[model samples]
Target: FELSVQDLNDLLSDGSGCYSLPSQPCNEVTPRIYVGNASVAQDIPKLQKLGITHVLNAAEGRSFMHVNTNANFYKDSGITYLGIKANDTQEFNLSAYFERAADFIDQALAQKNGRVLVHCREGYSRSPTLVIAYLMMRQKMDVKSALSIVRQNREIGPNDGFLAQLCQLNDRLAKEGKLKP
Candidate 1:
């Protein structure tokens, strides 16, 4: 939990399977947690096909998609949607929404056969950051272990800023007796 930046980056970037591209299929990272790009976020049929009970949209800016992806986008499908207007840049402070997003993910998984998809524009940075935070906070996983578990399902590379923020949370959780060593 107290690893250096270089060490954290090595853990987050450690993986062997297919690296994330622009868009890809929805992958079940953990039991009920899924992560993907905008393609899956906008595809209702695919969401239904995947049995996604809830959606956490990390990329909610107008620039992310031509069509608005507000809660109404999935309203007709009766899917619980939570949108976080986040940018994938290194300067973006995505840590601010960590708790709320993690709560949403937890709620989704609380239901029977619940499945959630946490996605950004490319499923590389923003969404992965939230998923990693949820694992660390709710599941009591360390940064390295959380990143390794996520990497097993889909290749992810949270930006330098997100990585730093996650590290900060890791240290904070450890100090607060919230995260396991």
Candidate 2:
């Protein structure tokens, strides 16, 4: 279900490239969900103190411009890790993580005392797209509404590419009677 570059451009042509200033290590997007930066993810003690049970690394990488940790990093903290190995580029297929990420987020919150943190390098691009994707897929929000909610919670810029994929999800979910446009 790959959209053409022209289609992606139109999906995000509103000049709202979803940009936002760099912010804190992390910020809450919902009672059970959060979007954060790489630094926060590196802090096991901080996650434990906040009662976080799961960590979703949207910008998973070991090379430049990405985080280097994985599940073993949290082995002693009992925190679960989900790495996407995703790219922060417009051409990358960010939609691949939509359902998987939503499922992880949903299951974590269902736990008696669980919280999930979604993160990328700066909490602005990759992580926001997945969190917004989760909101749209699991919470029945439209692309605009879901993105708006996350933006309100904390500044985020899902990138034009990510937003376009979200629009694709929006269309697909709407056709399946799973969400609104």
Candidate 3:
């Protein structure tokens, strides 16, 4: 059950040693959720066109793979904006933001016809990681199942550290009776 980072990356390997972008800027994982990159995050018109109701900017900042967007930037879009100042580094403690991210996503999906876009710079690491965590925590999916469902829809590779933390989350939730038997 404890797979190493290389093993997880191998599962997502498309013969590329480095993380790659999806063919499109974004792709819908579920009918209500989308994972995307920086360009989609900053483009309000595109989001409006998608009928997006919530904007979860995981990499929100001026530098370091960040997308410079916040609630005010989205004030005119009629979209509820949530900015999470996250970094793409392996050592960055992204697990700390898991609860907040999941809660926001839960709220988004709870709305009727609500659509949320979770994004970072590349949509490869931080954005997908939290979405997987949300599926594990709230959707009662095991980590592998959550990742599998998302991977089938979008090309994603969360950093090695985030992968490890997700593994830990899986084990914890399993022991906590939070996961299916």
- Which candidate gets the maximum lDDT versus the true structure? 3
Better of 2 and 3 by lDDT: 3
Q: Pick the candidate with the highest TM-score.
A: 3
54: Cα error in model 2, Å: 0.3
Task: Evaluate model 1: give its TM-score.
Answer: 0.89
Error of 3 at 146 (Å): 0.7
Q: Residue 130, candidate 3: how far off, in angstroms?
A: 0.6
Q: Note the residue pairs that clash in candidate 2.
A: none
lDDT of 3 by residue, 86-149 (tens): 8888899999999999999999999798999999998889999999999999989998788888
The residue-by-residue lDDT of candidate 2 on 157-177, one tens digit each, is 666788778888888888899
TM-scores, all models, native as reference: 0.89, 0.87, 0.94
TM-score winner between candidates 1 and 3: 3
Per-residue error at 92 for model 1, in Å?
1.1
Least well predicted 10-residue stretch by lDDT in candidate 2: 4-13
Cα lDDT, all candidates:
0.84, 0.82, 0.89
Of 1 and 2, which scores higher on TM-score? 1
